[PDB]
Design a protein around this ligand. Sequence first.
Ligand SMILES: C[C@H]1CCC[C@H](C[C@H]2Cc3cc(O)cc(O)c3C(=O)O2)O1
Ligand SMILES: C[C@H]1CCC[C@H](C[C@H]2Cc3cc(O)cc(O)c3C(=O)O2)O1
Ligand SMILES: N[C@@H](CCCC[NH3+])C(=O)O
Ligand SMILES: N[C@@H](CCCC[NH3+])C(=O)O
Lengths: 31, 499, 505, 163
Amino acid sequence: PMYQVKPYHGGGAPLRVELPTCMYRLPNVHG
Amino acid sequence: DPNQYYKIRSQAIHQLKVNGEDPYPHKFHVDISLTDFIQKYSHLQPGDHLTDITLKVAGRIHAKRASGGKLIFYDLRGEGVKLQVMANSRNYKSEEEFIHINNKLRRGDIIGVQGNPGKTKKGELSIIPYEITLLSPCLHMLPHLDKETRYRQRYLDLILNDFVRQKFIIRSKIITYIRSFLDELGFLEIETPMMNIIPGGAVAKPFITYHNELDMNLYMRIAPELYHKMLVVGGIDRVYEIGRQFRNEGIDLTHNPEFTTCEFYMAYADYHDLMEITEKMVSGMVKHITGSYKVTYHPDGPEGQAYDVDFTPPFRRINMVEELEKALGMKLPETNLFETEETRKILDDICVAKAVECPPPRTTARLLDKLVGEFLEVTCINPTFICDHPQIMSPLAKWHRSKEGLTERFELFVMKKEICNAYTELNDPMRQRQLFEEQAKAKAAGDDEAMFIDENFCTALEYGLPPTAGWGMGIDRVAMFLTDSNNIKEVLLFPAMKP
Amino acid sequence: DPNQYYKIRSQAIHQLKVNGEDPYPHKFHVDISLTDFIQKYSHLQPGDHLTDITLKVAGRIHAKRASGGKLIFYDLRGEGVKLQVMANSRNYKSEEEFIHINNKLRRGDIIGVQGNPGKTKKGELSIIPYEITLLSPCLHMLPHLHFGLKDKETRYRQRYLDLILNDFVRQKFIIRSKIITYIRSFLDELGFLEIETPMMNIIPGGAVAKPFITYHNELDMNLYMRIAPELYHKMLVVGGIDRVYEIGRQFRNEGIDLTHNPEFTTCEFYMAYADYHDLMEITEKMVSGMVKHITGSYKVTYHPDGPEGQAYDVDFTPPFRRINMVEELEKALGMKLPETNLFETEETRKILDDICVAKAVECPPPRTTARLLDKLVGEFLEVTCINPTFICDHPQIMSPLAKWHRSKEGLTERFELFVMKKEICNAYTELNDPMRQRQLFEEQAKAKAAGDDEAMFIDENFCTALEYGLPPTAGWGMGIDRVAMFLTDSNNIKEVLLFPAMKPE
Amino acid sequence: DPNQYYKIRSQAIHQLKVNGEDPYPHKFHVDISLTDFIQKYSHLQPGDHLTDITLKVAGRIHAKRASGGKLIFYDLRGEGVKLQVMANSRNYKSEEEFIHINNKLRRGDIIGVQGNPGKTKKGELSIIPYEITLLSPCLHMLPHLDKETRYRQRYLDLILNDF
Ligand SMILES: C[C@H]1CCC[C@H](C[C@H]2Cc3cc(O)cc(O)c3C(=O)O2)O1
Ligand SMILES: C[C@H]1CCC[C@H](C[C@H]2Cc3cc(O)cc(O)c3C(=O)O2)O1
Ligand SMILES: N[C@@H](CCCC[NH3+])C(=O)O
Ligand SMILES: N[C@@H](CCCC[NH3+])C(=O)O
């Protein structure tokens, strides 16, 4: 096996991108 | 009749425009995908109707079926799945509007649906609309259920044929898997020029183009090889590139003029290392994507027999010259004699005797290549390494450390077709320059297959390229084998076609 | 002298080949990277020597320093870091081999080193070799930071020299790679399919540009290198693939300057059932997220005029400022503009021409309505876009593939994202009415046949695809190289291209 | 003792402020209500763990229970319902962070949870966190399970009494 080289992304943790988001909703109490 | 349909529908849609009914609305607010809808409500019992839940979905109409005067079913498709729309006037916003929309809609139309989850008596999952909106009408008569048409109108192919999408999803998974594999090994993903003053790194007829601002002709790249090695000289020890190459050659089942490859270069590695890495990458790829090491392939298409191709490592290895000797039933010259005219003549004679055709020029490299094609490559069904090519056919490969006249090179073959090419990189600038001079001399004599000499690259080598091994893979061909396609056009979204 | 150096070293290396000393060995077994070596043994105390640990490393000699007859220091570099080799005669395999190898090696050579971790009295982490092996000699006089190379042209013509000598260059291309990887991750997670579409076309489309022309042997016809993948992407959306993206090369046969190269990399994506409002939100999220991930914060320092000019912090903190093109331009001009639509009207064109003249805003022929507006927008609006800024609602006459604005007559649902006066993104709600699209193509066609050589060709095939029904959709493009420029503090596109195109030397 | 608790927690929270750990963050992106979460995943079988699904929820901690050194249960309440948070270091973003957050959190705190739907062996619906965020700490000792107090501090009445 070839000698180890750490990934350029750092090696800490898998890339975790910030994604778009949507304010959650609660149901109509009267419905 | 299709022509009539188009004339009639076009007029009806223009009329919708004139009447201010907006047949191409700007925005429809899809709430949930069809896939998620199916997943969320498949647990429903026949007859159920969640009147409290209203959702918005969208897709393309593949079927329209009336049942009485107040009920119409639409087959709504998207994302490779389907959902029934069960429209009864009783649940619709209004009866008049129910009438108007149903009269407006046709097979092929893109629609948005607002309604409730439900299930028919027969147990068919459905959405029961409060309102249906036309999002984009189909002006043509949608086809139902040759290959030319599939390739010239890929969008039609994609609409009608579920498997096509799946092939391109698999293609994408292959590429993404490779990036993950190399990134994890500490490779840097790079981009090198697609336009070159001098094309190199392969044997191919190039595309030529005129660049205006530089007032000079340029060639489209046939490979990125020489740039990558210069980057390794630059001290970037591990590099890779997945990108397009261009070869101005013929089109057939396994060749397209533009195609996608992955090349990577690894300092302090040799060809033995690249064999293990190739095995691990390819076997791991097949297993991750298909669920096992064995994949079914129809080399002659579905009309013929199928074979399970076994990617379980380790792969079979054969040595070009030795195996060719066995295959021919005759002793070949010593490998240190492969540069001689005597050997060329011997190969020419063998080709004649065995009825192996080789068009001019009948050079040693080409005659050997034809022989290898005939007697060795055809035996490579499962993944097979063909190794230790003569130097005369491998002008960028490093001489073999123990076999005089050979090189430390391998090719990986699957189902008689080449998917990878790799070698310990030649890093002796004097020997590389000698080989380039021989190429250029052959080129001037009339051998079109000969390489151009690249001075900038040779100069780069003079600064010191570490011992290094490099590797290339034909992505399209890999995709062919993992999608059971025997025509490269199946794994290219828009293949080149004669108009 | 360098010329003499090369002759002498070449002969010496040749003599090594003759004597069977193998100066280009096939395989050396590296045990550990220099980065790992440093991380593992930085803890050592001055004077430490781990005699029980033997490791193999490799790299390029950047310096050679003799200290008496029995001690030599080599500055060994790789991976952007350095490690000192402290070669002591008594620790070497033998004194005779110690002399022989030292007499053989020169600055620049690639070597492999087998030895023990250690640290000098002065506290310098080192490896103490049992054996050193020449892996690949440098035949030229290797340049040095003090002298060289800062000369741009040499740097771009011999990028390998630039990478060897200048650590910041490697760092720029690492950042560039991180940008692309970030975008793929972002789009993959939103369910987009990464696709590849033809780079060679019968008709180039999807942008305004001069194409490259080439000859295809098999089909015996000329083909054009793509200027944009846009029309293929929309046909696939028609095909039912709702979300697609492609990061790839485009070719435009135009000028070369600080922000323009004839081949450059873009990302385009197309998203069914989205409009331009959705794409602004996604753009803000992607770009701000990218900047914070890569740099550690939303604020980036940039030198728009290079290191000899003033720097500015660019704030990518969302939400981005939004301005409407015509509105803001009218405010900046202190006057109202004439209304325009799809058709070129001489009255309107003349009014814009007069405005350009009065404001001393240049516009080379042809002085079309769209081009005069473009120049005006450049002078008065783009120059104010320092922080990321959306310029929105372009006139239809500037946007032949953009859908008409649902509430603003004569305008379109389009935006461009500007950073430091340069446009890093272009996007719009896609025109999906075939009759309207064909109509715009006919106007483009007229204008070509009238003298606009950048104007679009009718794509009869694409219009046909639109006739089968393109869902409401929004598309987007990003100039990857420009983003890289802004995130690497480069004001020249050549800094973020490994091998930029250069006029012959 | 309630007075002592308040003095001690107040100091700890001010310290979080000084250390730049932002104990009152501006925005947490709730993905789904607790009610919908319960409705969506009650069909799960004991032992299940949907590692492909990540969701964000929020609420008030009504109970904290350690089980060994690598497992802590939080009773998360809101909307008149409750959801168990099953935090094991093995599923958390990192062990060190797992330690830090658990040491920080107390009964009463408002928290945001990012994690996967799951079910314990015993059949308790749960969310298994990748990350927990303190949204608003409770500085006072939360009461458990006169009428004057209920009427003068209606918010306490509402927290404690579902009816
Ligand atoms: C980089 C190389 C390594 C060997 C396999 C493969 C060869 C490549 C040859 C080749 C030549 C050509 O003119 C057109 C094509 O579509 C291909 C191909 O797909 O496969 O990729
Ligand atoms: C696809 C587009 C969208 C807008 C930003 C960017 C524009 C693009 C224009 C452009 C034109 C050209 O001829 C040469 C170039 O290097 C560029 C560039 O880098 O930026 O990418
Ligand atoms: N450039 C080669 C692939 C890499 C070979 C090893 N450097 C080809 O096009 O076949
Ligand atoms: N093709 C555009 C980018 C995408 C615009 C939105 N469809 C360009 O080259 O500028």
